[PDB]
Ligand binder design. Structure first.
Ligand SMILES: O=C(O)[C@@H](O)[C@H](O)[C@H](O)COP(=O)(O)O
Ligand SMILES: O=C(O)[C@@H](O)[C@H](O)[C@H](O)COP(=O)(O)O
Lengths: 555, 555
């Protein structure tokens, strides 16, 4: 792999094996009153400020220099320009990677195969707004004349999680916007419980599928139409209750959807980076197009920051290299994302896909097997809830877990004159401080010495109440969680993922494991029918199939 | 630490060092036709069957034997008996650990401090039933004479996640029950968006708090009460709209709730193991007491199985030891929980708390610091969705990730004549099969050749489409996800967590990190008031606070 033989990488590993374990956060702060000033980054977007405080990390000026040197020796900047210019960096599928073009508000041309893609990008956007306007104003009528009250997005993976996470995060910006629903799982329970609360006459279905062949989505779409053609009767009506977001016109029309009701995107739009395209139609419908453009504008601002800022002060690059440090040097398997915001309850899950599906690879772009770790397992839940649960292991477990704490300064609901948000902010701050500082045996002893216990009882309990600390965290604070700021935050992590993939020299934009998945079920599906036992697979698969057949009708 | 000094552990460790990396699933199944039969366990509960297929694990008869020898020499059985008999095994807080008493349907006596605890357990249950009957039947009236249409649980951590996850999992059994809401985060958004959809006259609040002092819960409770009184005006009406689940009679009275409206539990009821107690009131209100008793009965059945079954055929013990194998021998940091069931969408999150908060420890019961790994990071999302996202990393990443795949044979929504469930089952089966088998270079090469790829195209794509497989999984299949089966499944994992805790010799029932967290914020809260900069903390904490103060004014 290109990595382990890289001089800057070897230098970093050499340094870590000699000083890595010695680094102590509490000691670093107690010996450098300027640590925060030197290890933090403030970004004025003109639409709110974003503070990236990466000072509670196990790094020194020297470490950061070695990390930035590695990013440079690995060609991060050149790779970046290649993506922004529309080059087919997605080598395995021979495609460009242009989610950045989807939000290119500057409209600077980006040529992909002879012609600029911006014109078609803006055309779909205009088509989206036009359609969105008709639905919102009550202009677009249902087959019996009523206005649409519910919009149901049907899709899975990249055609589901982005719009879901964003609509959830931007709920405060949904007006005369119809209710939005997200059906994704093939599990019948999903569409069933969703359709049970809907009126066919005022429900609009959005079939989101890049390829338009995914079994879960097409099956759910067909079931939804049957449920519709049910109370409706007559297939000419569908045209007023079903629209599509895809890149395959034939398949769409083949399903029964007119060309005018298809909002397309392109192959250079990865599912996990598609909410910025037609896929985000449910977002626009929910919060309006002005807010959707703000979302796009926020990402564009971050794209520019990432493209024009010196690596040393580049947000996504810093986040990426700190990750490299923990992954490749400390060997941390995971990365926690902890938003202190209820609206962002699907945020960690969104990047669990975005990150893991992008960098969960073991083959370099040249085809060589990596001999180092790649993408981490991303996970998390919004705080303060986690502080009462899994933070126990973060504080006193045997695993090093880098954590990104995020929070907006201003809340969308300043109830009780801000009492709730004040407490939320206090916990946000106190937790990272405690993870860094911990509580020594002596501090715990003195505290217990005041309990009136005694050397017998103080003794049995003391070690259990000691916190070794030295748990690294990043604190990301922003003025307010608005459509613009959310867009910037998402783009920030998209680029963090990009930078790491470059360092590891893998293809962060293909997903052969996901493609594999869409073909695996076909063989087993027909074998499930009937009570006759199956013996064509390994004994476990056979045994499970036979248990299923046996229990299928059990009362 | 006791583990590393254990003879059976060293033997296991030695064996792993000399052959561990040689184990290959595909080869193990290819050479053994009886593998499934030899590495699977069927449980007939008389209320559905549960098949635990652990054959797709990197183990042989010899490994399982060594693992079981370890469970025995680490005293699992004696520890189990100590828990069931009411001994105060929670050494640090000097408390018993009796969630098993909460669901002890057999009513066999459990002496705790000379007094059988069952009479009190059953008294609260009867009280819970009488109350829920009044509420559900409409007997219980609001301050204006209306029946209760919405029940709102206010609590956090152990006083929130269990009831939330169970009510979600058992939605099909909620007919005739009022709508249930869960408010937990201190973040004002949570209660504000909840109260916005409620009518004070028909809303009943349940304040769930073992201590009744947790800041998030009490603050949320006070906000709800203020909201309520804004309409009811008369504070004497609170008695008809507020009840409490707690162990602190004094604080409950202090809040303003009368004794007869307090459903109690005890100190030996850990929050993360409390849904079986009064904390489960919202569950009973949602699905009825018969269903709630079935839930308890399922757990009781699993408790008996765990207590009376020889280790070798003991479900929780097997799951626990397989985990020890991956954690202490293979060094895997995480454990994925993947339920192929939309109703179980919060199941993984529930055990993320139950497992991590229990075993995320680094101090043994003797006070020694562990010199080995303890609890893993637990995570996951329902299937099939994950297949289109993070499964990419599980299939082609650089991390070994044990996965538990769960699914009910019979669905609660057999729509389309069972088509949706058929596909779900096929995916469940094919995924574990592929994780095990993978796809060699030869197999991938043949496919590319069959697809008509040129030597060039095939050469450049080939490596990227290869799957090394050998990814271990457990497949847990049950007849149907009923209240009883859900209860058995939860209790099963509760005991897996218990067994591992005994092997590691840690206290799986305290949570000093969680206790610490509930006091950390108090110092910073008052410091946020005002515009003057703070300098009483480390430079990072100081800088963040000052950024917050500066941006508090930004418009
Ligand atoms: O990330 C991917 O590439 C997958 O999650 C896809 O988004 C998901 O399978 C949907 O594919 P499609 O939009 O073609 O239906
Ligand atoms: O697991 C725990 O012990 C915590 O998550 C508690 O459940 C949570 O802090 C609520 O504590 P209480 O019920 O006393 O309000």
């Amino acid at each position: 792999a290109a990595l382990t033989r890289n001089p800057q990488f070897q230098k970093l590993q050499q340094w870590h094996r000699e000083h890595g374990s010695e680094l102590n956060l509490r000691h670093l702060f107690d010996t450098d009153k300027e640590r925060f000033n030197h290890f933090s980054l403030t970004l004025n977007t003109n639409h709110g400020h974003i503070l990236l405080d990466y000072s509670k990390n196990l790094v020194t000026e020297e470490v950061m220099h070695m990390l930035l040197d590695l990013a440079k020796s690995r060609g991060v900047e050149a790779a970046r320009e290649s993506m922004f210019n529309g080059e087919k960096i997605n080598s395995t599928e021979d495609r460009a990677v242009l989610h950045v073009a989807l939000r290119n508000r500057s409209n600077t041309p980006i040529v992909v195969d002879g012609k600029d893609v911006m014109p078609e990008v803006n055309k779909v956007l205009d088509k989206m707004k036009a359609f969105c306007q008709r639905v919102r104003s009550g202009d677009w009528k249902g087959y019996t004349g009523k206005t649409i009250t519910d919009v149901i997005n049907i899709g899975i993976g990249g055609s589901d999680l982005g719009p879901l996470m964003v609509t959830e995060a931007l709920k405060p910006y949904s007006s005369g916007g119809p209710r939005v629903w997200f059906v994704s799982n093939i599990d019948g329970t999903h569409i069933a419980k969703t359709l049970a609360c809907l009126n066919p006459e005022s429900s609009l279905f959005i079939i989101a599928s890049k390829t338009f062949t995914t079994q879960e989505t097409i099956t759910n779409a067909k079931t939804a139409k049957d449920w519709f053609l049910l109370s409706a009767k007559d297939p000419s009506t569908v045209a007023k209750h079903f629209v599509a977001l895809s890149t395959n016109t034939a398949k769409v029309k083949e399903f029964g959807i007119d060309p005018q009701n298809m909002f397309e995107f392109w192959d250079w739009v990865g599912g996990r980076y598609s909410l910025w395209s037609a896929i985000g139609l449910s977002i626009a419908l929910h919060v309006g197009f002005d807010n959707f453009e703000q979302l796009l504008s926020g990402a564009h601002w971050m794209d520019q920051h990432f493209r024009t800022t010196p690596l040393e002060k580049n947000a996504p690059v810093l986040l990426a290299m700190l990750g490299i440090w923990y992954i490749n040097c400390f060997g941390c398997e995971t990365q926690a994302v902890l938003p202190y915001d209820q609206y962002l309850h699907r945020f960690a899950a969104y990047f669990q896909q975005g990150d893991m599906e992008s960098n969960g690879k073991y083959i370099t772009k040249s085809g060589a097997r990596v001999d180092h770790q790649t993408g981490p397992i991303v996970w998390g839940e919004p705080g303060t809830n986690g502080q009462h649960a899994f933070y126990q292991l973060i504080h006193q477990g045997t695993k090093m877990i880098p954590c990104d704490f995020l929070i907006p300064v201003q809340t969308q609901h300043p109830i009780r004159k801000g009492l709730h948000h004040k407490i939320l902010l206090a916990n946000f701050l106190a937790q990272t401080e405690a993870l860094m500082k911990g509580k020594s045996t002596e501090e715990a002893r003195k505290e217990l010495q005041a309990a009136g216990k005694s050397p017998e009882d103080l003794m049995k309990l003391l070690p259990h109440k000691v916190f070794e600390g030295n748990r690294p965290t990043n604190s990301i604070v922003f003025t307010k969680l608005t459509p613009f700021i959310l867009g910037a935050l998402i783009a920030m992590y998209e680029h963090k993922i990009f930078v790491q993939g470059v360092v590891w020299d893998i293809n962060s934009f293909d997903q052969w494991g996901v493609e594999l998945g869409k073909q695996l079920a076909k063989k087993i599906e027909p074998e499930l029918d009937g009570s006759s036992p199956v013996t064509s697979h390994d004994s476990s698969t056979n045994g499970l199939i036979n248990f299923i057949k046996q229990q299928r009708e059990a009362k």
